[PDB]
Symmetry: D2
């Protein structure tokens, strides 16, 4: 079938909760990233066949957030658009969907990725339409309910991370040392300019002129193991998961131009990487963090690779406990994993996250001349998605 | 490419706003439909490779409503699921997506369709997280915001219908006469059993007994042109669009088992219809109701067909103005269009509607021994989707 | 001191929760009652010196609900008004307040009483101004919070009633038998016209016609002991208090013109009754239902009277447990207590209830040619109020 | 009749909106002030006959805020309590009510004043009980609706201030110079310790120990006429009322022990002042700010005084425009008015305000040996209350 390539890969900076991007809707973050992805790919907007974007906290964002990002990016109205929700999987899944659509023969150029603004999530009154009748009710945190809460087990994704910590015996200390390592690598990557190629600035029109956001603000520079050790468990009494060893609540968009190799050649595009294979998998909701194990193994099988053949891995860090369990079971060389930091440091903008680590992966591959790459991440409700890349 | 077939096609009854399905979440409607779809295909839950469902008003429904429907239907945890939002296109677009993933070589059996419960949509407070500070604010009707409001022109879908009535010179009388015929056809179809095969019952089991819902309650039996002519305009002073010549706000799930022809043969399945081609297109948001013109033309071209070749046509009735504009410009034989009634009578459960019309089209094709069929509908934000079926 | 008299005494019908008065704000109920009170006293609006009304659930009713009732009743702007909240005592305490201000030499004519619409109470978000930050919160039922919940012990008024059933050893049977007699007396009183004089009609004039409300709808005609015995406990596992032996959640206004004897004589008024003495007392919040014991004893002492001297008694029926405890300890002849029914039948519109029972007592005194009367009721937070009347 | 005296007069500091007292409920501010008023009066809690406290934004504060302040102050439960709402009038009106009750012969010792926490006011959903049905609705700022909004004219109290500015020709410049003078006097009074006798500290138990609030934080020290002149109108295009010439939204409690002179002598109390007379009056809502003119003139008549006989005046400053119109018409010597600053500087905690200026007045009278004093203030909905004091 057709070969599928990444023509460009761009993200906004990742903002912290209620901070740098609090005033920028997800659709606007998306539009910004789309405009720049298309420029960087060296194609025209008229060349784009479809827009397929991840977004989880869609509540009150208005009809079809992907369509809104497309329109605001100034793409032609004739182009179809759809919004995909697979929780954290969403931004990665839109890229393998783009690959599938190209392999099916129905398109040659797709805008894919995702966008999230967790700072802007509303609160909900679920029975305001027909009435509460009597009695106190819940004023619902939509970010938690739609993004962070297991629908089957009625607890936080944080408890799924404790379950993996308990089952695998991943200790608090181990979780903290991985978090520390992620912090240090993200500081070194930011300060050394590793992310300059991939970040599109966001311009915020305020009262007095404008301000530019172009740097990932979530990392805690000069983090220490003592500092991490003082934190209290965040999710349960006497637990192991804290604020310091889990990611935050974050805002971002990450967008990729995906194309058939044939069209890329026809338009003079110099692709970054070939998408070699992909796969998604389900696991018990109760241990959703382990989803990447099974998605990765299936993707590696399809590609005819081994884990040891990989040059660079992005394995998301929603929680140290789940990253460490995946890492342990797939036997990753940890020196090749999240070489520029992971989500404990950088943030976890759920519907963008899977696209964000793919953007990070492909740019690291280009900069470091690393031939073979994997991107993978866990999904609430018990799933995983993985993609394999080979550099052009 | 592999050939792609519809193995089964099931829907719940369509409920009216605040009425027969008000106490049934979209994900439970979804699960009832899935469970019965699998049964009717003559396959086992284990035979399903993926679950792709439409759902527009996801607010507060929790993580990945498709996954929740899957799980509640008794489908294995290993099966990946994702939720699609293409506004009213959602339930139809999941089906062409399924065909694309099977054509790509990645699955053999997929649960597709959509689900919606508009009666259950919440109200939102957009600034409760960080605070209002001072002054009255909007308590936001999420159903309107996320389902029925144009994000770009800041007006209701109903104004887009008026734009089309104005630009195409479609009169109030033309719209009422179209609405009356839909009501007439719907009454006759219900009474003569046309929908009995396709409708799975919904059992509502409250604290003290049970209630079976298995009939479409939205039709107004004994409708008259005089009744319709008396109605007040719904969207603007002196408008042509009314409650009587537009659909309602409705609750439904509609689900299809989609398979490769090869796998259907391997599993002993007698498929209902082959998916011959499909397509989506965009159009000015202000005249979104015309999306089906461009989408139908693209699908017809791809299939090698003509409009005159078509035996049965499901062209959705969100508003009579848009159904009429589409039907005039495509030169449909209206004797072959919505033969069992359309959404003005039956309802328009947005995320499910696209799947609903396809379920209705394929059962009508089987019953009437009709070879070639077309399902298409308009999409808020200026889009349309179309699928062409050929009877097995 | 000046002698203080009741010139007129009027009330609306008492509506049931979510029923006949749901569309009538408390301040409009108030104005209808005021307008008719002035008329029935045979005075002019200009003769009124002040407006003092009870109202408990003031949330979102706007500035000074008493003033709004005054203005809407057609009373002059020069007349001062204030709104009193003594929970259920409010409507009775405004009357003793009026007597006190006239005794002080500061007015001759005062509009007193109370008003409530519990059906219309809002829900609240307590942290929307400065923000929730994260997590589900309480969507607060303001009717419960401000009207029915003990601020000190963090439980419903219904638990205070259970405390009294327990400490006084008042059985479920005693409570049901008391409730049945109230229902029996209420039916007989309505049917024989006992309330026709005191009730002013409420005209509801909507978009398309009108609806007169002029009958107390809360009574359950044909009540039986078997019916009552079957009921589930309302407040606690194995409780004695039920929906059948407690009052409801109700809507009413009740207003009295209070004057000096001197001014009534100057203006040609034939007063209904003299206010002989009054008093309020406190008690442990946990047994608030017993407040009327201490308040009645204080008022009786002040008047120079005895309980045995009383001809008619209005002792409110918020809960049968508390009515029974009070009546046992004061040794009331129950043949003389709530002769036309009590609140278990009629309803308990909290801010108006104290005025309601006084309106009912004085009309009963006039009709039955009864010389000495007593109105008293319990107050959430552990209080009681009592007024003693002597027929003119 | 009995002579009525002020035995003590105490207030909390006045906090700014969302600032120093944001975490202290009104009832807690009240309890603090009550405890200290009783100590300073040199009586026992058992000597107190009734509690009568002003509070306007009662929404969700729970049953009978006055009762809650009483209980939390540790006053005996046998003592009756009630909450009074006359908008800004409330805290002053409770003192003349206390006087009336004493003159009536029903009590000898009353706790009076008021409390407000505008920072803590909720938002409201008025139709959550029985349902919105469809459509966006208002998420209501309860502080604005219940405290700051005319119920008859459907605009802010700010527009009533513009109406007085326009009718009387009080210019922006004049309004600003009065505001400047109020600022300077409040700075001088705070820095010179004028308020030390009257302020009770509020202790806030936080995470790390506690913090004390004991100073009025609203004043803007080093205010200038240029700074005031730069502000934009706050209420209407091209208006005269700004943030700098109107008071804020503020938090406070102010409480007084009111007694008959006879009881004061019997208990060894050294009273501060005699309450000579009082009066309230109504005016058109549209010019509510002028209410004090008519209340003051009536109070002066009753006392047989003249305005020129007054030594000290507290005339509230909700808006410079209304203070100036009252001042002009009653011909006040402005050197004797608000000698320690007014509400433009100090704040306007609505339900406490009338008590706050009385506390300020009586302490200034004692400190400056000023024999005759007036306290007066405007009330939304078109009223005024005034009290005359003569020093013991």
């Amino acid at each position: 079938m057709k070969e599928v390539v990444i023509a460009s890969a761009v993200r906004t900076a990742i903002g912290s909760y209620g901070k740098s991007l609090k005033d920028v809707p997800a659709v606007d973050l998306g539009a910004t990233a789309i405009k720049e992805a298309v420029k960087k790919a060296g194609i025209k907007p008229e060349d784009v066949n479809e827009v397929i974007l991840g977004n989880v906290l869609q509540a009150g964002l208005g009809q079809n957030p992907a369509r809104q990002a497309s329109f605001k990016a100034g793409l032609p109205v004739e182009i179809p658009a759809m919004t995909i929700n697979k929780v954290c999987g969403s931004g990665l899944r839109t890229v393998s969907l783009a690959a599938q659509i190209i392999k099916a023969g129905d398109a040659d150029v797709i805008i894919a990725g995702g966008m999230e603004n967790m700072s802007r999530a509303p609160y909900l009154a679920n029975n305001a339409r027909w009435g509460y009748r009597m009695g106190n009710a819940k004023f619902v945190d939509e970010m938690i309910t739609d993004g962070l809460w297991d629908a089957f087990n009625d607890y936080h994704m944080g408890i799924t991370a404790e379950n993996i910590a308990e089952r695998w015996n991943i200790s608090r200390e181990e979780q903290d040392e991985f978090a520390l390592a992620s912090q240090k690598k993200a500081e070194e990557a930011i300060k050394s300019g590793q992310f300059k190629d991939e970040i599109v600035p966001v311009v915020i029109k305020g009262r007095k002129g404008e301000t530019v956001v172009d740097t990932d603000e979530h990392p805690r520079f000069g983090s220490t193991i003592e500092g991490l050790a003082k934190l209290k468990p965040a999710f349960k009494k006497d637990g192991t998961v804290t604020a310091g060893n889990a990611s935050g609540l974050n805002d971002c968009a990450a967008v990729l131009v995906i194309m058939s190799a044939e069209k890329a050649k026809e338009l003079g595009v110099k692709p970054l990487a070939k998408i070699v294979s992909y796969g998604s998998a389900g696991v018990d909701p109760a241990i959703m963090g382990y989803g990447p194990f099974y998605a990765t193994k299936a993707a590696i099988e399809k590609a005819g690779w081994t884990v040891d053949e990989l040059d660079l891995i992005e394995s998301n860090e929603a929680f140290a406990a789940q990253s460490l369990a995946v890492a342990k079971d797939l036997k990753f060389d940890m020196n090749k994993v999240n070489v520029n930091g992971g989500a404990i440091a950088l943030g976890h903008p759920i519907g963008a996250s899977g696209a964000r680590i793919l953007v990070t992966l492909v740019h690291a591959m280009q900069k470091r001349d690393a031939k073979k790459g994997l991107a993978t991440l866990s999904i609430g409700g018990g799933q995983g998605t993985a993609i394999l890349l080979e550099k052009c």
